[PDB]
């Protein structure tokens, strides 16, 4: 139906011979597994090698991942095996090419001979010290280590729309992943999304969870998921192809797997993360390049990752599979098996969830009256399983049943 793949990690830029050239060799495996969408890293010239400090946005040849021609071919290959491609869009902030008379880097260069994206400090937000105080105040949060772009500026909107239109029409990207989406307003995001008509979008809105005295996230995370639901409503709800990453489900699942699976049924009997309020708009995941990989800012318990996948890959939401977990952790076949269960049972983003049990050592759940998912160390559950259901997949801390 709709299965995402994050096609990179934090070390990818180092790849001998180039990341894109390397990933070319994995296109068939990705497509064959039932993945429908692959998320590739920011493609522009950037001060930082990973790509999250972009300067010359049209300058794809300066990317550490590989050059313009290589990206285009890689996107062509995914397209040839039916896979859509998502660009990591980093537009909250931008680095400037040249110093003004203050000696501050705030004269931008787009990477082309003409004046596209050749902004100056007037395009920087009002209170950002890289700027000159003439821009509008930031519509969202600030990123302290680079200039924040003033998205209310009319030249900015128009020229970023033109760049996205080139990423789409000429480079061949189909969809966007919005980096640091808290940095600018949903109204600003709506403008870019509506103007470019992507097949799919996902916002990265990452807010710290409120914790109890014991340092664990509160059982109640409604303020956390409400923020996600509010952003999606405000960009147009079902009149938009935009979703948000389910960082509520990530944060809860991180702790629930550690002998606390009762966290996976909220007060109202429903899932406690974004998928429990608006599953169609929730993009779930076990880890990404920030939370895991070599940054490990919020890692999933490493011994329990297949519990993570058993959950996201059978549940409502748009599940996203992380590169390392798929190719480097010895888990390819098990993940592939879960995706095929998902697809042949016709599980989809708005599928229906009925939580059966949620104890410390057990989480059990039926999806669309057709799949039952079990995670945790408790193995004896057959009295809890309805007649007609048979085990179709199992591993360390997980098992899946299908109806007949």
Q: Are 84 and 200 in contact (CB under 8 A)?
A: yes
Which residue, 55 or 316, has its beta carbon nearer to Ca ion?
Answer: 55
Active site residue 49: no
Q: Which residues bind Ca ion (CB under 5 A)?
A: 92, 110, 118, 128, 138, 140, 142-143, 148, 183
Instruction: Give the CB-nearest residue to Ca ion.
Output: 183
Active site residue 267: no
CB contact set of 48 (below 8 Å; sequence gap of 6+)? none
* 73, two tokens: 């071919």
Which residue, 39 or 105, has its beta carbon nearer to Ca ion?
Answer: 105
| Annotated binding-site residue? 148 | yes
Q: Is 255 helix (H, G, I), strand (E, B) or coil?
A: helix
| Annotated binding-site residue? 141 | yes
Q: Where are the beta strands (DSSP E) in 237-343?
A: 242-245, 282-283, 320-322
Least gap, CB of 260 to Ca ion (angstroms): 36
Which residue, 92 or 314, has its beta carbon nearer to Ca ion?
Answer: 92
The one catalytic residue in 59, 150, 204, 324 is 204
Q: Are 316 and 281 in contact (CB under 8 A)?
A: no
Least gap, CB of 78 to Ca ion (angstroms): 30
Least gap, CB of 36 to Ca ion (angstroms): 31
Element (H, E) at 5: strand 4-6
Beta strands 4-6 and 320-322 are: parallel
| Annotated binding-site residue? 118 | yes
Task: Give me the helices (H) in 319-380, please.
Answer: 323-327, 332-344
| Annotated binding-site residue? 214 | no
Q: Is 199 helix (H, G, I), strand (E, B) or coil?
A: coil
Least gap, CB of 128 to Ca ion (angstroms): 4
| Annotated binding-site residue? 79 | no
Using N-to-C axis directions, what is the helix angle for 305-312 and 332-344, rounded to 10°? Answer: 10
Q: Report how far residue 271's alpha carbon sits from residue 392's, in angstroms, rounded to the nearest whole number.
A: 24
Q: Are 312 and 286 in contact (CB under 8 A)?
A: yes
| Annotated binding-site residue? 259 | no
- From residue 141, give the alpha-carbon distance in Å to each of 241, 290, 388: 24, 19, 52
Look-up of token digits 């990752």: 305
| Annotated binding-site residue? 233 | yes
Least gap, CB of 281 to Ca ion (angstroms): 23
Q: What is the DSSP letter of 167?
A: I
CB contact set of 63 (below 8 Å; sequence gap of 6+)? 43, 44, 45, 46, 51, 71
Least gap, CB of 306 to Ca ion (angstroms): 37
The one catalytic residue in 59, 179, 334, 336 is 179
Q: Report how far residue 173's alpha carbon sits from residue 299's, in angstroms, rounded to the nearest whole number.
A: 29
* Active-site residue list: 179, 204
Known binding site for Ca(2+): residues?
Answer: 92, 109, 112, 114, 118, 128, 138, 141-143, 146, 148, 183
């Amino acid at each position: 139906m709709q299965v995402l793949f994050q096609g990179f990690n934090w070390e990818s830029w180092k790849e001998n011979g180039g990341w894109y050239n390397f990933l070319m060799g994995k296109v068939d495996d990705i497509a064959a597994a039932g993945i429908t969408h692959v998320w590739l890293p920011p493609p522009s010239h950037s001060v930082g090698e990973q790509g999250y400090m972009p300067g010359r946005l049209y300058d794809l040849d300066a990317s550490k991942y590989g050059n313009e021609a290589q990206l285009k071919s890689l996107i062509e290959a995914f397209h040839g095996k039916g896979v859509q491609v998502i660009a990591d869009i980093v537009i909250n902030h931008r680095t400037a090419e040249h110093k003004d008379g203050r000696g501050i880097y705030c004269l931008f260069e787009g990477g082309t001979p003409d004046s596209r994206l050749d902004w100056g400090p007037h395009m920087i937000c009002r209170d950002d010290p890289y700027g000159d105080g003439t821009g509008n105040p930031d519509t969202g949060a600030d990123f302290a280590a680079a200039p924040d772009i003033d998205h209310l500026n009319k030249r900015v909107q128009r020229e970023l729309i033109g760049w996205l239109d080139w990423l789409k029409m000429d480079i061949g990207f189909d969809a966007w992943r919005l980096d640091f989406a808290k940095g600018y307003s949903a109204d600003m995001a709506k403008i870019y999304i509506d103007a470019t008509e992507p097949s799919f979008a996902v916002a990265e809105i990452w807010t710290s969870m409120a914790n109890g005295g014991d340092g664990k996230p509160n059982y109640d995370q409604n303020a956390h998921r409400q923020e996600l639901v509010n952003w999606v409503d405000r960009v147009g709800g079902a009149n938009s192809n935009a979703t948000a990453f389910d960082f509520t489900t990530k944060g809860i699942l991180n702790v629930a797997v550690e002998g606390e699976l009762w966290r996976l049924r909220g007060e109202d009997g429903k899932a406690p993360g974004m998928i429990g309020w608006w599953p169609a708009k929730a993009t779930t995941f076990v880890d990404n390049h920030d939370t895991g990989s070599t940054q490990h800012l919020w890692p999933f318990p490493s011994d329990k990752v297949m519990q993570g996948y058993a959950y996201i890959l059978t549940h409502p939401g748009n599940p996203c599979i992380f590169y390392d977990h798929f190719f480097d952790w010895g888990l390819k076949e098990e993940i592939e098996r879960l995706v095929s269960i998902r697809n042949r049972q016709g599980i989809h983003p708005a599928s229906e969830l009925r939580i059966m049990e949620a104890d410390s050592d057990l989480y059990l759940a039926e999806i669309d009256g057709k799949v039952i998912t079990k995670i945790g160390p408790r193995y004896d559950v057959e009295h809890l399983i309805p007649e007609g259901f048979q085990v179709v997949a199992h591993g360390d801390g997980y098992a899946i049943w299908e109806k007949i």
